[PDB]
Each structure stands twice: as structure tokens, then as C-alpha cells.
Short mmCIF file of C-alpha atoms in Angstrom, two decimals:
data_model
loop_
_atom_site.label_atom_id
_atom_site.label_comp_id
_atom_site.label_asym_id
_atom_site.label_seq_id
_atom_site.Cartn_x
_atom_site.Cartn_y
_atom_site.Cartn_z
CA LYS V 1330 -0.86 -7.76 24.06
CA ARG V 1331 -4.39 -7.59 23.35
CA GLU V 1332 -4.70 -3.99 24.00
CA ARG V 1333 -1.76 -3.21 21.72
CA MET V 1334 -3.59 -5.36 18.85
CA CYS V 1335 -6.81 -3.63 19.55
CA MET V 1336 -5.31 0.04 19.40
CA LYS V 1337 -3.44 -1.12 16.22
CA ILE V 1338 -6.77 -2.23 14.52
CA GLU V 1339 -8.39 0.96 15.96
CA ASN V 1340 -5.78 3.30 14.31
CA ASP V 1341 -6.24 1.68 10.83
CA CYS V 1342 -9.99 1.10 11.02
CA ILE V 1343 -11.55 4.26 12.92
CA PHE V 1344 -11.71 7.75 11.61
CA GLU V 1345 -13.03 11.00 13.37
CA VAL V 1346 -15.94 12.77 11.90
CA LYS V 1347 -15.27 16.84 11.46
CA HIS V 1348 -18.20 19.17 12.17
CA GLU V 1349 -17.84 22.77 12.67
CA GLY V 1350 -14.11 22.13 13.74
CA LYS V 1351 -15.18 19.99 16.78
CA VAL V 1352 -15.33 15.97 16.73
CA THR V 1353 -18.89 14.70 16.95
CA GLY V 1354 -18.32 11.07 16.11
CA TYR V 1355 -16.32 8.15 14.45
CA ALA V 1356 -16.74 6.19 11.32
CA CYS V 1357 -15.27 2.71 11.42
CA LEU V 1358 -14.64 0.21 8.61
CA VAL V 1359 -16.38 -3.30 9.56
CA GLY V 1360 -16.22 -6.03 6.68
CA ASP V 1361 -16.67 -4.11 3.46
CA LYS V 1362 -19.16 -1.34 4.77
CA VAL V 1363 -18.44 2.08 6.05
CA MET V 1364 -20.22 2.54 9.38
CA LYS V 1365 -21.52 5.54 10.89
CA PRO V 1366 -24.72 6.49 13.09
CA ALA V 1367 -27.21 8.46 11.61
CA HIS V 1368 -28.03 11.10 14.25
CA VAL V 1369 -24.28 11.98 14.43
CA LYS V 1370 -23.76 14.72 11.87
CA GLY V 1371 -20.63 16.02 10.11
CA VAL V 1372 -18.13 14.91 7.29
CA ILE V 1373 -15.50 12.14 7.44
CA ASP V 1374 -12.01 13.33 7.94
CA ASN V 1375 -10.88 11.60 4.97
CA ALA V 1376 -10.96 12.46 1.20
CA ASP V 1377 -11.98 9.21 -0.34
CA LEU V 1378 -14.53 8.42 2.35
CA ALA V 1379 -16.13 11.68 2.02
CA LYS V 1380 -17.53 11.22 -1.54
CA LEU V 1381 -19.25 7.85 -1.13
CA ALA V 1382 -22.98 7.57 -1.31
CA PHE V 1383 -24.78 6.52 2.06
CA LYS V 1384 -27.80 4.59 2.44
CA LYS V 1385 -29.68 5.92 5.50
CA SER V 1386 -32.13 4.08 7.76
CA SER V 1387 -33.59 6.05 10.60
CA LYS V 1388 -35.15 2.76 12.20
CA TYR V 1389 -31.76 1.63 13.18
CA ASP V 1390 -30.06 4.99 13.20
CA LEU V 1391 -27.20 3.93 10.98
CA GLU V 1392 -25.86 4.99 7.76
CA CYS V 1393 -23.80 2.35 5.47
CA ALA V 1394 -21.91 2.57 2.26
CA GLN V 1395 -19.60 0.38 0.42
CA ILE V 1396 -15.83 0.80 1.21
CA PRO V 1397 -13.40 1.83 -1.73
CA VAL V 1398 -11.45 -1.12 -3.16
CA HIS V 1399 -8.13 0.26 -1.78
CA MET V 1400 -9.00 0.49 1.82
CA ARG V 1401 -10.45 -3.26 1.83
CA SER V 1402 -7.29 -4.46 3.69
CA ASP V 1403 -7.27 -1.87 6.29
CA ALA V 1404 -10.77 -2.79 7.80
CA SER V 1405 -11.76 -4.86 10.75
CA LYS V 1406 -13.26 -8.29 10.59
CA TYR V 1407 -16.47 -8.98 12.37
CA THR V 1408 -18.82 -11.80 14.14
CA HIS V 1409 -22.30 -12.48 15.15
CA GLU V 1410 -21.53 -14.60 18.49
CA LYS V 1411 -22.13 -12.84 21.80
CA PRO V 1412 -21.24 -15.58 24.60
CA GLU V 1413 -21.58 -14.30 28.08
CA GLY V 1414 -18.53 -12.66 29.65
CA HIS V 1415 -16.36 -9.44 29.16
CA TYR V 1416 -15.39 -7.78 25.94
CA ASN V 1417 -12.85 -4.96 25.21
CA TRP V 1418 -13.26 -1.42 24.46
CA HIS V 1419 -11.22 1.71 23.78
CA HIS V 1420 -12.41 3.12 27.19
CA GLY V 1421 -11.66 -0.36 29.04
CA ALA V 1422 -13.73 -3.41 29.51
CA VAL V 1423 -17.68 -3.72 28.95
CA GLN V 1424 -19.66 -6.24 30.99
CA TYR V 1425 -22.06 -8.22 28.80
CA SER V 1426 -24.82 -9.91 31.04
CA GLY V 1427 -28.10 -11.03 29.99
CA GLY V 1428 -28.26 -9.58 26.48
CA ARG V 1429 -27.01 -6.14 27.92
CA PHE V 1430 -23.94 -4.16 27.36
CA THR V 1431 -22.87 -2.19 30.78
CA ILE V 1432 -20.13 0.30 31.35
CA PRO V 1433 -18.66 -0.28 34.78
CA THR V 1434 -17.38 3.03 35.37
CA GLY V 1435 -20.05 5.09 33.54
CA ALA V 1436 -17.04 6.93 31.88
CA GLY V 1437 -18.67 7.49 28.37
CA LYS V 1438 -18.76 11.14 27.00
CA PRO V 1439 -20.79 12.63 24.32
CA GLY V 1440 -19.16 12.63 20.98
CA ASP V 1441 -17.71 9.27 21.29
CA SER V 1442 -20.49 7.56 19.41
CA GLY V 1443 -19.17 5.13 16.61
CA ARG V 1444 -16.55 3.52 18.48
CA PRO V 1445 -16.97 -0.26 18.09
CA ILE V 1446 -16.92 -2.85 20.83
CA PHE V 1447 -14.38 -5.46 20.21
CA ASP V 1448 -14.27 -9.11 20.71
CA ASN V 1449 -11.61 -11.11 22.61
CA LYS V 1450 -10.05 -12.09 19.20
CA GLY V 1451 -10.08 -8.46 17.87
CA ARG V 1452 -13.27 -9.00 15.95
CA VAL V 1453 -15.99 -6.27 16.04
CA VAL V 1454 -19.41 -7.16 17.87
CA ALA V 1455 -21.57 -4.10 17.74
CA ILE V 1456 -21.38 -0.26 17.38
CA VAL V 1457 -22.18 2.18 20.33
CA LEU V 1458 -24.78 4.88 19.93
CA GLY V 1459 -25.46 6.20 23.32
CA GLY V 1460 -25.69 5.18 27.12
CA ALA V 1461 -28.20 5.33 29.91
CA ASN V 1462 -27.40 6.17 33.59
CA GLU V 1463 -28.29 3.11 35.86
CA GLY V 1464 -27.01 4.12 39.05
CA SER V 1465 -23.25 3.75 39.16
CA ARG V 1466 -23.34 1.79 35.87
CA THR V 1467 -24.23 2.85 32.48
CA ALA V 1468 -25.93 0.56 30.04
CA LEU V 1469 -25.10 0.86 26.30
CA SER V 1470 -27.73 1.64 23.54
CA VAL V 1471 -25.89 -0.22 20.92
CA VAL V 1472 -26.41 -1.47 17.32
CA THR V 1473 -25.63 -5.36 17.21
CA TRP V 1474 -26.05 -8.16 14.48
CA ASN V 1475 -27.76 -11.42 14.13
CA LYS V 1476 -26.49 -13.86 11.62
CA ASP V 1477 -27.90 -11.76 8.96
CA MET V 1478 -30.24 -9.01 10.73
CA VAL V 1479 -29.32 -5.69 12.26
CA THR V 1480 -30.94 -5.01 15.58
CA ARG V 1481 -31.01 -1.90 17.58
CA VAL V 1482 -30.89 -2.30 21.43
CA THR V 1483 -31.88 0.58 23.53
CA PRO V 1484 -32.46 0.42 27.14
CA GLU V 1485 -34.86 2.77 28.77
CA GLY V 1486 -33.51 6.30 29.32
CA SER V 1487 -30.73 6.19 26.76
CA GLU V 1488 -29.24 9.50 25.69
CA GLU V 1489 -27.66 9.77 22.15
CA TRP V 1490 -24.15 10.73 22.88
CA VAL B 1095 -58.61 17.85 -17.31
CA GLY B 1096 -59.74 17.01 -13.89
CA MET B 1097 -60.18 13.44 -14.46
CA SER B 1098 -56.69 12.97 -16.32
CA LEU B 1099 -54.95 14.94 -13.38
CA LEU B 1100 -56.69 12.69 -10.66
CA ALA B 1101 -55.50 9.49 -12.46
CA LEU B 1102 -51.87 10.78 -12.93
CA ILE B 1103 -51.85 11.64 -9.21
CA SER B 1104 -53.33 8.51 -8.03
CA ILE B 1105 -50.79 6.33 -10.22
CA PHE B 1106 -47.98 8.42 -9.06
CA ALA B 1107 -49.00 7.82 -5.46
CA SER B 1108 -49.08 4.01 -6.06
CA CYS B 1109 -45.70 3.98 -7.81
CA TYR B 1110 -44.17 5.95 -4.83
CA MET B 1111 -45.64 3.45 -2.56
CA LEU B 1112 -44.35 0.52 -4.22
CA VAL B 1113 -40.78 1.99 -4.40
CA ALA B 1114 -40.97 3.11 -0.82
CA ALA B 1115 -42.07 -0.45 0.44
CA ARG B 1116 -39.07 -2.03 -1.58
CA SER B 1117 -36.70 0.51 0.09
CA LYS B 1118 -38.02 -0.26 3.36
CA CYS B 1119 -37.91 -4.03 2.87
CA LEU B 1120 -34.38 -4.24 1.56
CA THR B 1121 -32.75 -1.50 3.58
CA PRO B 1122 -31.60 -3.75 6.49
CA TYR B 1123 -29.76 -6.01 4.05
CA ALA B 1124 -27.03 -3.30 3.12
CA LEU B 1125 -26.17 -2.71 6.76
CA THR B 1126 -24.80 -6.22 7.05
CA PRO B 1127 -22.20 -8.07 5.05
CA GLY B 1128 -24.46 -10.79 4.46
CA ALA B 1129 -26.37 -12.36 1.66
CA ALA B 1130 -29.60 -10.79 -0.29
CA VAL B 1131 -31.78 -14.08 -0.26
CA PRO B 1132 -32.08 -14.71 -4.08
CA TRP B 1133 -35.72 -15.72 -3.14
CA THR B 1134 -36.39 -12.33 -2.20
CA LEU B 1135 -34.06 -10.75 -4.96
CA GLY B 1136 -36.21 -12.24 -7.80
CA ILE B 1137 -39.57 -10.89 -6.56
CA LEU B 1138 -38.00 -7.63 -5.15
CA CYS B 1139 -35.47 -6.11 -7.71
CA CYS B 1140 -32.39 -4.36 -6.10
CA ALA B 1141 -29.66 -2.35 -7.57
CA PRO B 1142 -26.85 -5.11 -6.79
CA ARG B 1143 -27.67 -7.58 -9.69
CA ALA B 1144 -24.71 -10.02 -9.24
CA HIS B 1145 -22.44 -8.56 -6.77
CA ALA B 1146 -23.29 -8.99 -3.02
CA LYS J 1377 8.98 -31.01 4.02
CA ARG J 1378 5.43 -29.64 3.00
CA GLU J 1379 7.16 -27.04 0.65
CA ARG J 1380 9.31 -29.87 -1.04
CA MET J 1381 6.32 -32.01 -1.41
CA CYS J 1382 4.14 -29.12 -2.90
CA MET J 1383 6.80 -28.25 -5.33
CA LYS J 1384 7.37 -31.84 -6.59
CA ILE J 1385 3.65 -31.95 -6.96
CA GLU J 1386 3.33 -29.01 -8.79
CA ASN J 1387 6.25 -30.18 -11.24
CA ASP J 1388 4.31 -33.28 -12.14
CA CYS J 1389 1.04 -31.50 -12.43
CA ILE J 1390 1.62 -28.38 -14.27
CA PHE J 1391 2.40 -27.69 -18.11
CA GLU J 1392 3.47 -24.30 -19.36
CA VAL J 1393 1.30 -22.63 -22.12
CA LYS J 1394 3.34 -20.47 -24.47
CA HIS J 1395 2.19 -18.13 -26.93
CA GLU J 1396 4.49 -16.41 -29.63
CA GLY J 1397 7.32 -18.20 -27.71
CA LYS J 1398 6.64 -16.76 -24.24
CA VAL J 1399 4.61 -18.31 -21.59
CA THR J 1400 1.15 -16.91 -20.80
CA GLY J 1401 -0.43 -19.34 -18.46
CA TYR J 1402 -0.49 -22.74 -17.07
CA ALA J 1403 -2.77 -25.76 -17.34
CA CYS J 1404 -2.94 -28.22 -14.51
CA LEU J 1405 -4.29 -31.91 -13.87
CA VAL J 1406 -6.73 -32.28 -11.12
CA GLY J 1407 -8.37 -35.61 -10.32
CA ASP J 1408 -9.02 -36.89 -13.87
CA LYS J 1409 -9.55 -33.65 -15.88
CA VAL J 1410 -7.41 -31.16 -17.46
CA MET J 1411 -8.18 -27.73 -16.28
CA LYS J 1412 -7.02 -24.41 -18.02
CA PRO J 1413 -8.31 -20.96 -17.51
CA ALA J 1414 -10.27 -19.96 -20.48
CA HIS J 1415 -9.15 -16.26 -20.86
CA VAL J 1416 -5.42 -17.31 -21.34
CA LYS J 1417 -4.40 -17.97 -25.10
CA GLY J 1418 -1.83 -20.20 -26.35
CA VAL J 1419 -0.96 -23.99 -26.65
CA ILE J 1420 0.08 -26.60 -24.06
CA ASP J 1421 3.54 -27.71 -24.25
CA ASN J 1422 2.32 -31.20 -24.52
CA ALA J 1423 1.70 -33.52 -27.61
CA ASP J 1424 -1.19 -35.34 -25.85
CA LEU J 1425 -2.76 -32.60 -23.98
CA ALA J 1426 -2.57 -30.11 -27.09
CA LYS J 1427 -4.70 -32.50 -29.28
CA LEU J 1428 -7.65 -32.97 -26.73
CA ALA J 1429 -11.04 -31.35 -27.40
CA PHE J 1430 -11.41 -28.66 -24.76
CA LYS J 1431 -14.84 -27.82 -23.41
CA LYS J 1432 -15.59 -24.12 -23.35
CA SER J 1433 -17.65 -22.02 -20.98
CA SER J 1434 -17.60 -18.17 -20.76
CA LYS J 1435 -19.37 -18.11 -17.34
CA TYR J 1436 -16.88 -19.74 -15.34
CA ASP J 1437 -13.97 -18.77 -17.61
CA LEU J 1438 -12.76 -22.25 -17.70
CA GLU J 1439 -11.67 -25.00 -20.02
CA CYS J 1440 -12.06 -28.70 -19.19
CA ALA J 1441 -11.08 -31.95 -20.79
CA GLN J 1442 -10.78 -35.58 -19.94
CA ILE J 1443 -7.23 -36.90 -19.28
CA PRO J 1444 -5.84 -39.80 -21.20
CA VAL J 1445 -5.18 -43.03 -19.26
CA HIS J 1446 -1.51 -42.98 -19.06
CA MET J 1447 -1.44 -39.41 -17.17
CA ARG J 1448 -3.93 -40.68 -14.49
CA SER J 1449 -1.01 -41.55 -12.05
CA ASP J 1450 0.39 -38.11 -12.61
CA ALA J 1451 -2.42 -36.10 -11.41
CA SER J 1452 -3.50 -34.32 -8.15
CA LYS J 1453 -5.99 -35.37 -5.85
CA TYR J 1454 -8.75 -33.05 -5.36
CA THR J 1455 -11.01 -31.92 -2.30
CA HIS J 1456 -13.94 -29.46 -1.70
CA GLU J 1457 -13.45 -28.62 2.07
CA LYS J 1458 -12.20 -25.04 2.54
CA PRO J 1459 -11.47 -24.43 6.44
CA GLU J 1460 -10.39 -21.05 7.51
CA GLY J 1461 -6.58 -20.50 7.87
CA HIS J 1462 -3.43 -20.80 5.69
CA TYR J 1463 -2.93 -22.69 2.32
CA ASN J 1464 0.25 -23.26 0.10
CA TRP J 1465 1.12 -21.65 -3.09
CA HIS J 1466 3.78 -21.59 -5.62
CA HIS J 1467 4.79 -17.71 -4.70
CA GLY J 1468 4.40 -18.31 -0.97
CA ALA J 1469 1.33 -18.92 1.61
CA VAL J 1470 -2.13 -17.95 0.87
CA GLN J 1471 -4.41 -16.80 3.65
CA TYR J 1472 -8.19 -17.77 3.76
CA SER J 1473 -10.27 -15.18 5.71
CA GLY J 1474 -13.96 -14.32 5.41
CA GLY J 1475 -14.61 -16.30 2.08
CA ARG J 1476 -11.66 -14.61 0.37
CA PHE J 1477 -8.31 -15.79 -0.88
CA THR J 1478 -5.80 -13.03 -0.30
CA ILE J 1479 -2.05 -12.89 -1.11
CA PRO J 1480 0.12 -11.46 2.00
CA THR J 1481 2.77 -10.40 -0.50
CA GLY J 1482 0.78 -8.53 -3.09
CA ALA J 1483 3.44 -9.82 -5.59
CA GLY J 1484 0.96 -11.31 -8.05
CA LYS J 1485 1.88 -10.74 -11.75
CA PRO J 1486 0.44 -11.38 -15.24
CA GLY J 1487 1.42 -14.95 -16.40
CA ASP J 1488 0.70 -16.69 -13.14
CA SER J 1489 -2.79 -17.69 -14.06
CA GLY J 1490 -3.98 -21.55 -13.55
CA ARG J 1491 -1.54 -22.30 -10.72
CA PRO J 1492 -3.34 -24.38 -8.22
CA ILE J 1493 -3.87 -23.14 -4.71
CA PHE J 1494 -2.85 -26.29 -2.40
CA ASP J 1495 -3.95 -27.43 0.96
CA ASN J 1496 -2.00 -28.92 4.01
CA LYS J 1497 -2.13 -32.40 2.56
CA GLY J 1498 -1.32 -31.60 -0.73
CA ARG J 1499 -4.88 -31.52 -2.16
CA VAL J 1500 -5.87 -28.67 -4.58
CA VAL J 1501 -8.45 -26.22 -3.31
CA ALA J 1502 -9.09 -23.93 -6.25
CA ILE J 1503 -7.47 -22.33 -9.16
CA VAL J 1504 -6.06 -18.78 -9.63
CA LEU J 1505 -7.33 -16.64 -12.29
CA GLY J 1506 -6.60 -13.07 -11.22
CA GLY J 1507 -6.51 -10.72 -8.38
CA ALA J 1508 -7.66 -7.27 -7.39
CA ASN J 1509 -5.20 -4.69 -5.65
CA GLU J 1510 -6.16 -4.21 -1.99
CA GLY J 1511 -3.56 -1.61 -1.28
CA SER J 1512 -0.95 -3.67 0.42
CA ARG J 1513 -2.83 -7.05 -0.22
CA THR J 1514 -4.53 -8.54 -3.14
CA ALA J 1515 -7.77 -10.41 -3.30
CA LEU J 1516 -7.59 -13.52 -5.50
CA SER J 1517 -10.48 -14.17 -8.13
CA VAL J 1518 -10.20 -17.87 -7.91
CA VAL J 1519 -12.33 -20.93 -9.27
CA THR J 1520 -13.30 -23.49 -6.57
CA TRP J 1521 -15.48 -26.59 -6.37
CA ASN J 1522 -18.37 -27.35 -4.24
CA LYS J 1523 -19.44 -30.64 -3.13
CA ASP J 1524 -20.72 -31.27 -6.80
CA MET J 1525 -20.61 -27.61 -8.32
CA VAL J 1526 -18.23 -25.22 -9.67
CA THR J 1527 -18.51 -21.56 -8.58
CA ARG J 1528 -16.33 -18.48 -9.40
CA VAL J 1529 -15.51 -15.91 -6.66
CA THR J 1530 -14.44 -12.52 -8.24
CA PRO J 1531 -13.77 -9.68 -6.01
CA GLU J 1532 -14.56 -6.21 -7.48
CA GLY J 1533 -11.77 -4.51 -9.58
CA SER J 1534 -9.94 -7.80 -10.28
CA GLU J 1535 -7.69 -8.00 -13.29
CA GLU J 1536 -7.05 -11.07 -15.23
CA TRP J 1537 -3.28 -12.25 -15.10
#
């Protein structure tokens, strides 16, 4: 049930980025802002989203733009609360403990940057950038939100996927 | 000519520094779906005048 | 039950405004004040209401006036609380999500301006002015009340109905 809902939201709110014929990342529609990590280079596989003007900020490694009017109903809804526990993801479940996002399997692959991490109610919590290999686990270098502030969490040894 | 050119260079540098400081202060507010803090909006002019 | 009460309340608290013989908007009684959208043009189909002095304000696009004594018992009861969820409407049910009023049907048509948006207990929440086509949905540009203040919420691209 939750998996089907999450996949349905992901179908309507995630777009692959095409560069030199190979996928490099994903651009997601959160709230009313187009999302894309800055270090990932390419063009959105969408005519409408390709022409938007992007505001770049290398401090947080994120590029954002205002979504067009006619895609406002096909965008996810967000939140800023991060209680301890587990959260859903396209590659399984992520463990949130002590302010850290951890991948139980270490199944992350380069080129998967830009895939949002979802809440239990289908809301978006954060946007992944890369992962750091801690033994059998893999901590996530992720861009999360406060009430009104963006914060970039980067564990030591993270590699930009 | 030398004095005029130096004055123009200095004034351009100061104006660029003001614009860059404005952009650096107001960059994080366009990466959230949040409010712009009218207190800061008054002092620091931004492109969104009424919307967002 | 709820639908029947809402339509009975709408019958007692809506008067049609007709211009050149055709209706263009509706003026509704909320609390103890006659409220009509300012942008609509015409006259109210009521001898008592049409003779009042309507205060004008272009910022909020609203006309207000004081109701006479003998229609005070025929006026809705107002409120200022806006919890997240579902609210009633004349053309169906409206959804309140993320500070926005949206129409699930997307069947908004010119000439429906001024119809109140109703609460669960029959209280009036806002007033409809126009909406913006969000593809399959439409974001409403509505006039609400704070504790003691009026505000206007207009999503981008909205058209006056």
C-alpha cells in the first residue's frame, strides 16, 4: 500500500536528467520549486522544465527554480519534522538514528543522486547527494530542511554519487 | 585620467561587493518553500516584491 | 445531512447579482455585514441590499456594508480557524492543503464568484473570487479572515470568475 503510493508519487514527481545519452541524476518537484543537485550536470528530460532559470548555490550544492503553473498539481508535499525511526526510499528503507541517514545494504549507486527520501505519510523529508561507506552500512550525505533553513549534512568520507 | 579610472574601479568594486553580499544573504530563502522575513525584505531588496 | 444543511444555509444567505439580465456574481451575508466581490459588476436582486452604501477597497477586491436589523437572523455565522482537510462548497468539496484552497473537480466557471466556502459545522471560512488552472486541479484565489484582519491569497496565474 505504502510502496504503491510512494511509487505513484515518484512517477509524477521525478524526472531523469539526460547528459551525453547517459543518466546522471534526477530532478524532483517539491512544493513549488524544481530541485536538482548542483554537482550533477545535464539537462532535464522535459521541454517545459528545461527552459527555467535556475538559482545556483554551491554552499549547499543545490539548484532550484520556480515550477511552471501547470505542473503545480503534480508535485509532492514536504515537511520539516524528522522523528527517530525509519523512512521509505526507492531503494528500500533508510535508518534515521542520531541525526544520521544510513543505508542498511549499501546499495547506493552513482547516478542515483536527486532521489528524494520520503516520510511515512508520503511527504518528502530530504534530497540525497552521495554516500559514505561505513563498514557494511553507508551513511547518506543529504540535503535536509529546518523550519525555514536548508542544511547540508555531510558525513566524513562521503563521495558525490 | 588615472584618478578618474581609479575612482571608477573602486566604485564598481564596492557595488559588486554589495550585490554579491545581497545574493549570498538571500540565496538560502529560494531553496525552501518559506517566507522571506519582511524585516529583511525591507532592508535587503529582492526580486520577489509581493509574491512569495 | 451536512449537504442539506449547507444548501439550506446557502439559500438563505446568497442573493444573485444580475447585469444586463444575466447573473454575474453573488453577494453573501456573513456575520452582520454584506460582502460582495468588488470586481464583479451588477446590482443585487434585493430592494434593501441594493440601496446600501457599499464601502470600496481595491487592495482586497471586496465590497462591504452593514446589514439592516431585520436580516440579522438570516445571516451565516463566521469563524477564523482553518484546520487542514476538507471543506464543503456549492459545487462539491474543497481541499485545504498547504495554505491553499484547491478544487478537486477543476470545474470552476466564470459567474460563481462570491460563493462562500463552508466549514464542517456550517461556518464560513473564505469567499471565492477566482482560480488558477493547475492542470487537473485549480488553486482558488480566495479572501479569508484572520483573528481581526482580512487577507487576500492569490495564486499565480489566477483568473477572476
